[PDB]
Design a binder for this molecule. Structure first.
Ligand SMILES: [Zn+2]
Lengths: 106, 50, 249, 114
RNA sequence: CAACACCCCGCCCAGACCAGGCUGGAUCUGCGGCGAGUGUAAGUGCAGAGGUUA
RNA sequence: AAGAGUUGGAUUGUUCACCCACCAACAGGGAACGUGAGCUGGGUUUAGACCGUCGUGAGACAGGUUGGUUUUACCCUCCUGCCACAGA
RNA sequence: GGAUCAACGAGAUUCCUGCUGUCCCUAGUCGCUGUCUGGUGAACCAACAACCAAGGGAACGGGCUUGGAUGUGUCAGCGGGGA
RNA sequence: AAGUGGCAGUCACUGGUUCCAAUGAACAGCCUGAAGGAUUCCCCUUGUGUCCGUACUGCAUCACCGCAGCCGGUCUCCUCGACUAGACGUCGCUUGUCCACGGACGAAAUGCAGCUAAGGGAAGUCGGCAAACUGGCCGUGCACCUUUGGAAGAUACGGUGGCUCCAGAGGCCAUGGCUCGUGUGGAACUGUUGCUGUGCAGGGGAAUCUGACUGUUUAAUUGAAACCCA
RNA sequence: GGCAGGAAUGGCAAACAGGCAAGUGCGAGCAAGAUUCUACUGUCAUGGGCUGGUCGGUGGCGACACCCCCUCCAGGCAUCGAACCAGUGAAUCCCCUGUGGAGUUCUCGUUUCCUCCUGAUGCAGACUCACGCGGGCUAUCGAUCGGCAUGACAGAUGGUGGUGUAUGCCCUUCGCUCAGCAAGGCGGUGUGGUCUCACACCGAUGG
RNA sequence: GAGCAGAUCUUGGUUGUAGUAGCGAGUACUCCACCUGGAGAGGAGUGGCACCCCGCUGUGUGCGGUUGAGGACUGGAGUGGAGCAGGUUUCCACACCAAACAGCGUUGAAUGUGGGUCAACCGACCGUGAGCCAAGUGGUAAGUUCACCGAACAACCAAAGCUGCCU
RNA sequence: UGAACUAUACCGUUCUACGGUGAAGCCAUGGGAAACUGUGGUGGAAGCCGGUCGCUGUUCUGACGUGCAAAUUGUGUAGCCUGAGUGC
RNA sequence: ACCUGUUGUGGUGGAUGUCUUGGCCCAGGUUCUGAGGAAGGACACAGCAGCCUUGCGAUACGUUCGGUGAUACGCAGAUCUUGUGAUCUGGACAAAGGAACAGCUUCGAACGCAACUGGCCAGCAAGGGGUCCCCCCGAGCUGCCUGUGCGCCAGUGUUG
């Protein structure tokens, strides 16, 4: 019958671990992750669930390249907060710097 | 059962490794540290999804 | 509310044919130079039972048209056809049982089966157990031919359509009353998911235009129109008449 | 006798399929074990058309025993040997001979009626 | 302090537990006997349908 | 004059009714039409189903029919026995 | 679908036989409970409380009014009440 | 020289026989033949066999699911001796286990279970509900009705132990030796008339309504006359 | 690059189907793995190096038997339902005789119980007329000869060749003998020191 | 975001009930011995005795584990032996039960530590089946869990990348 | 999102004691002028019967109903058990 | 003894008060990802480490270099001091010099084909190792659409 005695026949596995999201949401039979939708290249995400986005947004993982580019951006930003940028070499000093270098090394 | 995938076996081994209590020397770390291991599973209590 | 059985069948998910263990299409050898100009010989190599079909089939082996080979075609068997029979296919074939020849070399009394409906087509008419057509008449003005079909109809088909001479084997099988429900169970288990058949008066109005009511009945005329949408096209579809058939049909 | 007289599957299949077929032998160590059988194929046969009868003079080997077997286990020393029985070979010969004779008769009689 | 009551240890005319009754040289545990219930114990020597052997 | 009594059955889910008897007599009533954490569940009154009539229909029917989970007390009191303290 | 209808039915009904604690009309016996107990030990429910009669009253009160009882506290039960 | 102690169930193979308006996979791989063509003349990472699973549990009374260490559920394989028709049921060797919260008191009332009960025998009750009767096998035998198949185990009658015998079937070696009916029939004796002695194990008959039958059904209140069938 | 062939895209998908090949001591020795380690005894698939004369040959009446690469086509094995009957074999189980050990013995019981075993593998053997288990085919003979016969539980056969006979020929399940192999195992009886354990001896290779 | 007695108000902590109802399917235990801080049982039991000793007196039907001796159950469709799915270290050993859990606790699937899973022959892997994907093409405003899977069976399709000899 | 319960289709695959009964076909045989027919066997069919595993779930309207259990339970009682059977 | 009460005290409990490396709000600036492999997901990596880390990748709580300048620390253990020098810090990050710019397992747009497989013991192959062969290891190349170029082609398309 419905409950206790049919909960015993409940072995098997509809879903197993997905290789994109590491979540036990990858449907075995129809090989489709129920969370990220693995086989298709886009990641599955709907606006009707902000929490589901929150749980995957950039900033919840290593960010092992975006953290570096963001720290670089932070260096630049906290320089430009001190003072607007001033290019070291421009059209008006290239020649002077270059001939100074030339005479100094010659 | 005996039948496994290599991925499943690596995951089960990592879970076995995680299933460990905090070192003794960790509480003494000056800025008050963890007292006990709050992420600790037991085969009876909670099952792995896998 | 909900769709109808004959509307969920056409969707074709679990109503597909149970054809996995069948033999394939049973058709006449295709039209080539030999079968058009003269005749080609084929050996009836085997007679076999096909699942879901009432007539036995025949693996008949011909030579390849242009290759060193042997093409083993498969056609519904003619009654009396035996293994090793040497059937003949073509325009200059003789009027013998099992031979396949155009509908023009046939006199106006011939009994034919495996009849084509189009030229170069391959045996789309008179193919069930004990089925046979009768060549009524020829017209050389058009190159066409009136034939009487098992249904009792009279169809006009070109005189280049090829038939097979004789009856379709396995005849007489509706002359045995199925005695049990299990016989029809095994019958349809190899054809398709169509048996048993719940009748619509026994359903609820959500499942069929006939369901519901405190007495099992149809409250409206059963004879439904031909322009009836799919979903209210249940009952007697565009019936020209009803009741017991007496006198002429 | 030792350890009882009940037995146990020893391979990775616990279903009574046509490929398990244990044998229940008794070992030198007074034990009782199973040894698995092997499928004995039907060996070559005459065509389904010509009666599906076994051909004598050939031993039944599985596929790879057939690949590695001596030639006498596989062949016979007749025409169509190993592929046809002597009777079918004989009717084949006689049908061929008589049909060629009739062909000769008819072509020479038509070149006569010329 | 004693005097008594109660508890533990005993027995039931009593009792769900309590309560009630009786008892301390009491009693308890056996043994013997009587009356009773069954129906003629094992072991060992009267017939036994027959078969078997000298 | 209300002390004691006022029964056994057949049909019917029946109260009632109606018969068969017995008897001194087989009176009439109440108690949340006493009494379902007392019982039963026959009936009414779900979901299933059949018939009849009604309705185009789904469906209706003091028209008939069949089949259909009645849970909990250890609280307080009353009652029944039981016991102690009586100290306030 | 109307009427017969063999066989079948955990279908509905009626009769007969046999058998019976269903009953007259109950009794005895037994296991596991309960009962006493060592260890452990919840929940339902809870305005506050917890003896009645009559009266009046949201017309059926535990409280109000007029009476009658009532020492406090138990243990096992109990199904009248706590609409 | 080179089957053979016995015979029971299981397994395997073999030879078949029945059933189907049902005829009961494919692929890789392998082999033979037919016709052509062509034809110089022991040693090596103990050669190579790389990669992954390999513990234990697993009809679990504690390893899974059921919130749990839940009397539920959950796939397959092996499967001894005696009684017996037996994979029923009862008991025993092998294996495993004594773990389920216990103890006293003959242990109230009530209860849930097992039994009995004189005389009567449905008077109980909506209603024979519940329980009881019967029960295996052998022999004799069996009615109405019938779709001729059944009904039917109709209904019914008799027997059944123990022991001692008498008949009764076969096989091998060579009509004698040996094996040899746990399989049947009869008789004598026997017993406090009692024997399918235990577990097990139909009560029967006669009608009306209804669905032909078998099958199906609302998991968790309805199993039906409903659905399905031919 | 030339010539000659070559329709019909690449995969996934069964830890029950298809699909090469391993058994015993279940041990040397494990606390815990074992057709995986170990000791023996095998099996399978596959690669490389080396050393004027060409349709493999022959025997049998036959069924057939023996010794010495390439292309294409035709077939076949893989390969297939279920039930029932009969046969043979296996292990289990039991019986008889005997042995070794043990239980009972108040009386009886030549009694009661255990054990007395044998795997894969072998280009080993004898049969195969299965003279143990049965089908197919061959040759000879030519039936029903007037009562047709043969063989089966039942079928089933036979001038489309029965019965009978024989160098008969083939395949297969077995079984049997041998090697494995008794050295192992099983039931015991002892010696030696003892030890962080090896030797000795006996006991059905029964029907 | 400014006052609580209520909203079957929300969150938390509690109380009575109550040491109560209970912890009653799967037949069952018993004796000796050892393991203990104690477990044939005492808090300074009591009189001498001045702790030893000698007397007297009390002890709950008695924790746990494991040998052995009995009594019983499983009774081969097993409470036995193997493996599937699931579990995922629960396997083994030692320490340890005075942290907690096991409706006891010298025991355990508990806790802590440390170990353990060896393959040419057992299986996945090789394909194929039902079915699916890419490709090819098409549909859609557009991605798609959009369509087709067609060597029985498709198309709108230039998918033979391989083989023999010469080089 | 879900076909792990559950419904159904397909692919592969598994399981199905012991009895009763006795269909066709067959053997011997009695009768008959013949057509036909009596008897004794053999044989082992059936969506046949009893009945085990198993599945289902009638009845007690039993247990439980703060349960063993959000559907189980009985030292009961029942339905089917070669098939339209059954599971994976 | 029990109950009721009032105090004192002790428990159970976590209300209050005070704060806060947190949030919320407003304003300003930037928006700086990826086939040269992103965002995410795995598995690894510490003497004693399980978790966490916008730690890290077989160079694995870190490597080079710069700024700083004696610590780090829960234990220990050798390195380290007027110094190539402990620690912390800076996008592997400053050098104005076209000087200098390391490494980064594995899935993932995920890229040879697949994959519930670390499979096909893929094809080709620089090299390294064991012994011309052969054997083992093996960097690296092989994804699609589109664009351009190069090579080879196809067409009873138009022509010569
Ligand atoms: Zn995913």
């Amino acid at each position: 019958t419905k409950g206790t005695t049919s909960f015993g026949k409940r072995n098997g596995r509809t879903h197993k671990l997905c290789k994109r999201c590491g979540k036990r949401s990858w449907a075995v039979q129809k090989k489709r992750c129920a969370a990220c939708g693995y086989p298709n290249p886009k990641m599955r995400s709907f606006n009707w669930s902000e929490k589901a986005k929150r749980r995957n947004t950039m900033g919840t993982g290593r960010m092992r390249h975006m953290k570096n580019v963001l720290k670089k951006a932070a260096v630049r930003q906290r320089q430009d907060q001190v003072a607007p940028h001033q290019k070291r070499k421009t059209a008006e000093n290239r020649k002077k710097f270059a001939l100074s270098r030339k005479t100094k090394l010659a | 059962g005996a039948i496994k995938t290599l991925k499943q076996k690596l995951k089960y081994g990592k879970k076995m490794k995680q299933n460990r209590p905090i070192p003794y020397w960790v509480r003494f770390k000056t800025n008050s540290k963890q007292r006990y291991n709050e992420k600790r599973r037991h085969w009876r209590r909670t099952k792995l999804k896998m | 509310g909900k769709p109808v059985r004959g509307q969920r069948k056409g969707a074709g998910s679990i109503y597909i044919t149970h054809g996995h263990k069948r033999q394939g299409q049973a058709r006449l050898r295709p039209l080539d130079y030999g079968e058009r100009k003269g005749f080609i010989r084929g050996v009836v190599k085997e007679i076999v039972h096909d699942s879901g079909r009432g007539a036995p089939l025949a693996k008949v082996q011909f030579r390849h048209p242009y290759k060193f080979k042997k093409v083993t075609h498969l056609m519904v068997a003619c009654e009396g056809m035996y293994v090793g029979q040497y059937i003949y296919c073509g325009k200059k074939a003789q009027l013998a049982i099992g031979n396949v020849l155009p509908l023009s070399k046939m006199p106006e009394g011939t009994i034919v089966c495996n009849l084509e409906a189009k030229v170069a087509d391959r045996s789309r008419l008179a193919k069930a157990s004990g089925a046979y057509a009768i060549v009524i008449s020829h017209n050389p003005d058009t190159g066409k031919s009136r034939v009487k079909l098992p249904s009792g109809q009279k169809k006009t088909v070109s005189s280049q359509c090829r038939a097979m001479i004789g009856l379709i084997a396995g005849g007489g099988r509706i002359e045995k009353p199925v005695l049990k429900a299990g016989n029809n169970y095994y019958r349809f288990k190899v054809k398709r998911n169509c048996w048993p058949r719940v009748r619509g008066v026994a359903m609820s109005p959500v499942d069929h235009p006939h369901g519901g009511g405190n007495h099992q009945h149809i409250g409206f005329p059963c004879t439904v129109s031909r322009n009836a949408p799919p979903g209210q096209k249940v009952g007697l579809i565009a019936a020209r008449r009803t009741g017991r058939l007496r006198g002429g049909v | 006798a030792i350890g009882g007289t009940r037995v146990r599957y020893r391979r990775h299949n616990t279903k009574n399929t046509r490929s398990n077929k244990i044998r229940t032998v008794r070992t030198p160590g007074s034990r009782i074990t199973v040894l698995y059988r092997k499928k004995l194929p039907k060996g070559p046969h005459t065509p389904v058309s010509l009666g599906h009868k076994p051909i004598p003079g050939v031993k039944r080997l599985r596929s790879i025993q057939r690949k590695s077997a001596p030639k006498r286990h596989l062949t016979v020393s007749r025409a169509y040997g190993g592929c046809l029985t002597h009777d079918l070979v004989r009717e084949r010969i006689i049908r061929a001979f008589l049909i060629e004779e009739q062909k000769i008769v008819k072509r020479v009689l038509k070149a006569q009626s010329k």
